[PDB]
Write a protein that binds this ligand. Structure first.
Ligand code: CLA
Ligand code: CLA
Ligand code: CLA
Ligand code: CLA
Ligand code: CLA
Ligand SMILES: CCCCCCCCCCCCCCCC(=O)OC[C@H](CO[C@@H]1O[C@H](CS(=O)(=O)O)[C@@H](O)[C@H](O)[C@H]1O)OC(=O)CCCCCCCCCCCCCCC
Ligand SMILES: CCCCCCCCCCCCCCCC(=O)OC[C@H](CO[C@@H]1O[C@H](CS(=O)(=O)O)[C@@H](O)[C@H](O)[C@H]1O)OC(=O)CCCCCCCCCCCCCCC
Ligand SMILES: CC(=O)O[C@H]1CC(C)(C)C(=C=C/C(C)=C/C=C/C(C)=C/C=C/C=C(C)/C=C/C=C(\C)C(=O)C[C@@]23O[C@]2(C)C[C@@H](O)CC3(C)C)[C@](C)(O)C1
Ligand code: KC1
Ligand code: KC1
Ligand code: KC1
Lengths: 179, 227, 176, 162, 176, 172
């Protein structure tokens, strides 16, 4: 919300530098998207932290196709390694949350998820502002991290485990790009 | 209702650096070096001295003294790091002991010369860079709101350190401020290219320019065999 | 307030140099230094237990240098065996934490996060945990200093010394 | 700090160094505390050295381990042959004294008065003249004992007969 | 005064550029630069005479590098043969002299000493010796540069040029 | 004109104990001791330079003790190599200078000699040289301790230490 100053944190303040908020109704649409994109991209960043660390389940993801959990790539192509009979299950459960349980039509972003004494907002309202800003700020940093993780695999061809094993962290002197 | 920065893009005066792009209203003209260059609108969203604590984290409206403070300290370091990227390749290197190891100060690639010199060389440079930043914070503690950006109390005016006299006239002094700022912005671009070429070539810049400003060994004429 | 905390029961307000009555304008920075030196030493003491218990991560901290995490010594020479490009990455991030995230020019030490996130609702349950941070912080200052001088005097790290049973300084080969 | 317990018929308020030329009572009562803290230890240390040099021992078997009291040498070498299980007990109990029961718990009427109303061998039957010289005795007895005990240890390592 | 101190008989006031009234405020540093350059070049001419007379110190400049004093070239490559830790000592001492002891920002050259420790009280005699210091500085400035270009154009030091009988120009000379 | 004779650049007036108005009464002696300790130390660092450069007097100091000038050590133990019949001769003669000829009773430091026999009549000429005698006297006091301390912490004299390349603080 604008009046509490939820997204405006202390390094930059009200960081709308290109002038996109020209009234109050288009802020609530944009914050509903920013908070939703931040919640998706945070679980996307914890995915790449877990996948590129090699932490896999034991057994077969698809035993009728013989596809182990170990032979899914930890990079940007690992989701499509998965058989489409299997990730139709992912789209159908996540689509059921998006329409019924956590309806993404709710622009407020509240879905009542309260983990009680870890947020007693009625007796410490400063913890409300701390946890509301940190949901956006960790979502904004993970939105740029997953755009980092995606394009670093595209321009190098290696995933994050492979380009860190090679020490390939500089776009200069390598055989890739015109630099 | 509207953003505080959407109102600065509503006035949106004519620019000079980007004369097709209509610089925002927060570039008032009253600052040194403002040429109407803010296409991303950072001056509409001004920062405060966050390092002083939480009460300094907010930025005052219309005050870019901390953006200019970070601009001057980036450019003053960048200026002396052009020479640091160049002068070992031009004026030779320093010799080493058996303690530090011979050829420790002798890596003409400036980026892996960071990882070749001893750690006590890097630590004492960092602590000297630390000491003048302690001197900076103690100046911004004392001056506060009347703190001029880039002031380390070195030079001409009030009770500053002036071992050279340096007693400029009061508007040849603002030309020196503009000469400093234009060299700050230029050497920031220059030290980026030095850092990027040292990675891309693997050698120093005198070692890449000097190899390109020389004739190749197969193209060189044998030359001057006429008695 | 802050001038009565740090003063617990077995001694009270303990200032043998008398700088509370002499220079009260320097106290709240000196409390901030005491709290920061405490919090640094508490992570430093806990680090020495974890290092000397041979809890290492895996692999190489610097594969160019061919230097594993277990190749790091568990004593004083451990942070200095880390390569200089690696030590510059620690200090650049710790300067980002100590100037931007938890700015150490903020002298009340209060950075938005509470005690495990929560603000202590009572005022003297707050003062009890404010004293427990200071007292554990003051005890860890002597703990990390007592671990650094006793490594460089006995020549062994804390695993080395404890393996050897070199606990008695009166019947070994030392001074006195 | 002219007339109190250190003021003295041979040498009244000696004070050569720059210690207490001010009115800071809290500086003085800290330094007065440690001077009898050093004196009360060193008084028992003069006696505690000269019973070991005279060869007097406890009747034997400092441990179940087969080490007697006469096997333990005298001087600085006593510290190396005391069994380490018992040398923890010496440091833990002296630490138990120095933390808990050695204090101005209840408030004495001077510095060093550690009678908490628990143990008192008199101190009412004095004529207010005799109290302050009888703790000016133990200040000066503690004064000479710490130059006494420092002589016994500088000359043990030197080897000089005393 | 300082404006009258550089003028002597055959030329008088001599400025072809005319900066004595074009830039009258820049004069009092430009006198101090001329006096500094003159003082530096006078010691440089006397140094080259001493080096080429083979007056050496009888020892080792750097015994670490097996470098005797007599192994150093007596020409323009003299301090190029000094080891780099040796020029660091020269630059550190004359940082103390050119910034603190006799600071070059003092634009009258009047630091502590007189002429052999004497303050010349006669103003016409003091102006005479101030004229001599400037004129011998101007002569040594031309003298040291014509010494330096005669070495690099012959490839010989001043001892070798007077050993081979090479005073006559193979290039083209200019001297009084 | 003696309370401004030690005041120079960067330090200016330097008194961390604050004795200049803790004891304004004892400055006349305390200046005369600093000047005397400066004059003794200035002739001592010059002494360590002459001794470690092997400038000797090419003869016998004590032919009775069969002892020539080149046999005396050039370090801190050179005063002990002199026989006591000879060092009694120097405290018999410096008793004549320190009590009678230039008495150290005289707290001015001023005797019949001037600066190379001349009286300096320009007053900061004279105060410049008086500041130099104090400052070179102060630097020689810290110089003669740093010579004697660094000798005994290496055991070698200054000639021996420089010949071995023992300048950099390796062992300390
Ligand atoms: C999901 C995308 C998204 C959306 C809808 C928003 C929306 C908002 N942000 Mg947030 N933000 C985001 C991601 C997003 N943000 C990310 C990733 C960061 C980290 C860089 C931030 C950092 C940030 C800060 C620090 C602040 C905001 C604030 C705001 C509010 C101010 C209006 C504004 O600037 O709109 C943005 C304009 C648009 C979304 C429309 C333009 C769309 C562009 C043209 C698409 C092109 C993007 C390009 C492909 C990739 C960009 C990354 C690239 C530079 C590498 C508004 C609610 C302010 C606030 O909340 O104040 C109360 C505030 O202070 N944002
Ligand atoms: C154990 C340490 C110790 C401490 C903290 C003190 C403290 C004191 N002494 Mg005591 N003193 C001591 C040992 C000590 N003394 C011993 C062992 C003797 C016997 C030689 C004396 C003999 C003595 C006399 C005769 C007098 C004092 C007096 C005093 C008081 C005035 C300050 C002073 O001049 O002390 C001296 C300072 C020190 C001893 C600190 C030592 C610092 C040096 C640099 C250490 C190295 C040596 C002060 C309470 C005076 C007094 O009580 O008047 C009321 C007084 O008249 N002292
Ligand atoms: C009152 C309770 C108590 C009890 C039951 C004990 C019991 C013991 N003491 Mg301990 N001790 C005590 C209090 C006590 N002590 C106190 C108050 C002191 C004075 C500080 C000591 C000082 C002491 C020393 C110096 C030694 C013992 C030793 C011993 C042990 C005998 C030998 C052995 O190893 O078995 C025995 C277990 C001996 C030991 O530890 O043997 C290795 C030994 O050397 N004791
Ligand atoms: C170190 C350089 C230097 C500088 C800064 C000066 C400065 C000055 N000279 Mg001096 N002079 C010099 C060297 C210098 N001189 C030398 C070597 C000679 C002997 C040839 C003289 C002979 C001389 C005479 C006879 C007189 C002066 C006078 C003056 C003063 C007049 C102000 C003026 O308008 O001068 C003009 C500005 C300058 C001289 C500085 C400009 C420097 C030029 C542009 C550098 C380029 C030189 C060029 C590269 C040389 C190449 C050839 C060489 C290598 C052989 C001024 C203080 C006059 C005076 O003192 O009256 C008060 C005067 O009567 N000069
Ligand atoms: C300061 C006064 C001075 C003096 C006494 C000399 C003296 C000399 N010069 Mg030098 N010279 C000087 C300044 C001086 N120079 C200056 C300021 C320059 C310009 C930087 C030069 C540039 C120079 C060159 C390039 C050469 C000399 C040479 C000589 C030698 C022979 C000159 C000759 O006979 O040519 C004839 C004289 C004339 C045509 C003029 C009348 C002679 C030792 C020559 C040499 O060293 O021989 C190998 C030589 O080649 N001089
Ligand atoms: C309202 C309903 C909402 C439903 C929302 C559901 C969304 C589901 C999540 C979608 C996540 C996003 C997927 C992105 C696609 C991707 O990952 O590619 C997968 C592959 C992986 O390849 C891989 O490459 C690897 C090669 S190597 O091993 O690394 O060498 C290899 O290992 C691997 O097998 C191979 O697969 O990556 C690439 O091909 C790089 C693609 C570069 C970017 C594509 C741009 C997409 C087009 C949009 C452009 C703008 C459009 C506007 C203009 C009209
Ligand atoms: C309060 C003030 C704030 C200050 C904050 C300070 C921040 C700095 C502290 C950061 C903590 C230190 C991290 C060091 C990581 C590292 O180097 O260890 C390397 C190791 C093993 O390396 C690899 O592990 C491999 C085995 S495997 O990956 O574990 O299977 C092995 O094969 C390989 O050789 C080896 O390279 O990696 C890990 O185990 C640690 C990473 C775990 C994080 C994954 C994120 C998912 C969980 C988060 C929820
Ligand atoms: C060199 C090398 O390799 O390393 C070596 C080094 C070294 C040191 C040699 C090693 C070792 C051995 C060590 C360190 C052994 C230490 C063991 C340890 C730490 C043993 C704790 C006992 C406490 C007990 C049983 C508590 C009873 C407590 C009771 C009965 C209570 O009621 C407590 C109480 O609080 C309550 C619960 C209830 C309250 O109402 C009342 C109170 C307050 C009273 C190793 C392992 O060999 C490794
Ligand atoms: C921003 C993303 C990022 C990248 C992409 C990255 C990469 C590398 N890190 Mg770094 N790093 C951080 C961030 C990043 N690091 C952070 C947040 C911290 C906590 C403060 C941190 C700590 C250390 C330490 C202690 C060391 C270190 C190293 C390397 C090196 C390994 C390859 C190699 O060295 O062969 C590669 C290039 C080691 C090193 O520099 O060795 C010379 C080393 O010792 N890192
Ligand atoms: C008045 C004239 C005069 C005579 C005639 C004379 C004679 C001797 N001097 Mg004396 N002397 C001075 C004056 C005179 N000395 C003066 C002004 C000083 C400086 C203050 C001085 C200093 C020393 C020192 C340091 C030593 C010393 C010695 C002898 C000894 C040599 C013969 C020998 O020793 O066989 C003979 C008797 C050495 C010594 O006494 O050795 C046992 C010795 O070490 N002198
Ligand atoms: C309600 C109970 C339930 C049953 C009884 C069931 C059964 C199977 N699932 Mg499972 N599933 C969920 C629930 C259930 N699934 C849920 C809540 C999710 C998260 C949204 C989920 C996700 C995936 C993914 C990613 C894959 C997947 C698969 C299979 C396949 C294994 C044998 C096979 O290989 O056919 C059998 C039929 C794999 C697959 O379909 O491969 C073609 C595969 O890749 N599933």
């Amino acid at each position: 919300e604008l009046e509490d100053g939820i997204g405006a944190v202390a390094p930059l303040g009200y960081f709308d530098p290109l002038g996109y908020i020209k009234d109050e109704e288009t802020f609530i649409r944009y914050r509903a998207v920013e908070r939703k994109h931040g919640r998706v991209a945070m679980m996307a960043m914890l995915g790449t932290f877990v996948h590129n660390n090699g932490w896999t389940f034991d057994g077969y993801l698809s035993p009728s196709q013989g596809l182990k959990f170990s032979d899914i790539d930890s990079g940007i192509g690992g989701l499509f390694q998965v058989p489409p009979a299997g990730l139709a299950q992912i789209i159908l459960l996540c689509g059921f949350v998006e329409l019924a349980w956590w309806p993404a039509s709710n622009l407020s972003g509240d879905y009542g998820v309260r983990l009680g004494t870890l947020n007693d907002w009625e007796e410490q309202p400063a913890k409300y502002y701390r946890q509301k800003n940190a949901e956006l700020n960790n979502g904004r940093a993970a939105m740029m991290g997953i755009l980092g993780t995606f394009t670093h695999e595209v321009i190098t061809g290696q995933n994050f485990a492979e380009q860190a094993a090679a020490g390939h962290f500089s776009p200069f002197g390598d055989g890739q790009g015109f630099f | 209702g509207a953003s505080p920065s959407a109102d600065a893009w509503a006035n949106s005066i004519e620019s000079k650096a980007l004369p097709f792009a209509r610089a925002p209203a927060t570039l008032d003209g009253t600052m040194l070096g403002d040429f109407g260059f803010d296409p991303l609108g950072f001056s509409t969203v001004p920062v405060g001295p966050w390092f002083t604590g939480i009460e300094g984290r907010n930025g005052q409206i219309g005050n870019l003294n901390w953006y200019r403070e970070a601009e001057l300290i980036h450019g003053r370091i960048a200026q002396v790091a052009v020479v640091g990227f160049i002068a070992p390749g031009l004026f030779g290197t320093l010799p080493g002991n058996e303690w530090t190891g011979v050829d420790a100060y002798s890596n003409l690639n400036p980026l892996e010369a960071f990882s070749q010199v001893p750690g006590l060389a890097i630590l004492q440079i960092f602590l000297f860079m630390s000491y003048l930043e302690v001197r900076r914070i103690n100046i911004i503690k004392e001056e506060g709101e009347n703190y001029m950006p880039g002031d380390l109390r070195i030079g001409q005016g009030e009770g500053r350190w002036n071992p050279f006299g340096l007693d400029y006239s009061p508007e040849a002094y603002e030309e020196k401020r503009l000469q400093e700022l234009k060299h700050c912005r230029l050497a920031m671009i220059g030290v980026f290219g030095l850092w990027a070429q040292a990675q891309a070539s693997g050698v120093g810049v005198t070692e890449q320019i000097g190899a390109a400003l020389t004739t190749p060994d197969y193209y060189a004429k044998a030359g001057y065999f006429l008695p | 307030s802050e001038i009565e905390l740090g003063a617990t029961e077995p001694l009270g307000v303990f200032d043998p140099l008398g700088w509370l009555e002499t220079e009260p304008e320097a106290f709240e920075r000196r409390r901030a230094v005491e709290r920061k030196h405490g919090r640094v030493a508490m992570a430093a003491v806990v680090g020495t237990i974890v290092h000397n218990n041979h809890i290492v991560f895996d692999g190489y901290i610097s594969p160019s240098n061919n230097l594993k995490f277990s190749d790091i010594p568990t004593g004083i020479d451990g942070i200095f065996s880390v390569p200089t490009a690696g030590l510059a990455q620690i200090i650049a991030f710790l300067g980002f934490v100590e100037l931007a995230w938890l700015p150490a020019s903020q002298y009340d030490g209060d950075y938005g996060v509470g005690y495990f996130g929560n603000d202590i609702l009572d005022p003297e349950e707050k003062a009890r945990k404010l004293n427990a941070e200071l007292n554990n912080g003051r005890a860890a200052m002597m703990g990390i200093m007592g671990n650094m001088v006793a490594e460089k005097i006995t020549g062994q790290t804390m695993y080395e010394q404890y393996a050897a049973g070199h606990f008695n300084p009166f019947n070994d080969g030392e001074g006195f | 700090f002219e007339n109190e317990l250190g003021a003295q018929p041979p040498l009244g308020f000696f004070d050569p160094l720059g210690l207490v030329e001010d009115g800071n009572q809290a500086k003085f009562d800290r330094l007065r505390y440690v001077e009898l803290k050093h004196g009360r230890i060193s008084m028992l240390a003069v006696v505690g050295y000269l019973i070991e040099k005279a060869g007097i021992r406890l009747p034997g078997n400092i441990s179940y381990d087969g080490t007697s009291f006469a096997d333990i040498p005298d001087g600085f070498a006593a510290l190396s042959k005391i069994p380490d299980a018992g040398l923890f007990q010496l440091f833990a109990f002296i630490g138990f004294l120095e933390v808990f029961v050695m204090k101005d718990i209840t408030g004495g009427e001077f510095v060093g008065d550690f009678r908490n109303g628990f143990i008192d061998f008199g101190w009412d039957s004095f004529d207010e003249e005799t109290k302050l010289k009888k703790r000016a005795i133990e200040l000066n007895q503690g004064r000479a004992a710490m130059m006494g005990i420092l002589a016994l240890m500088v000359h043990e390592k030197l080897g000089v007969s005393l």
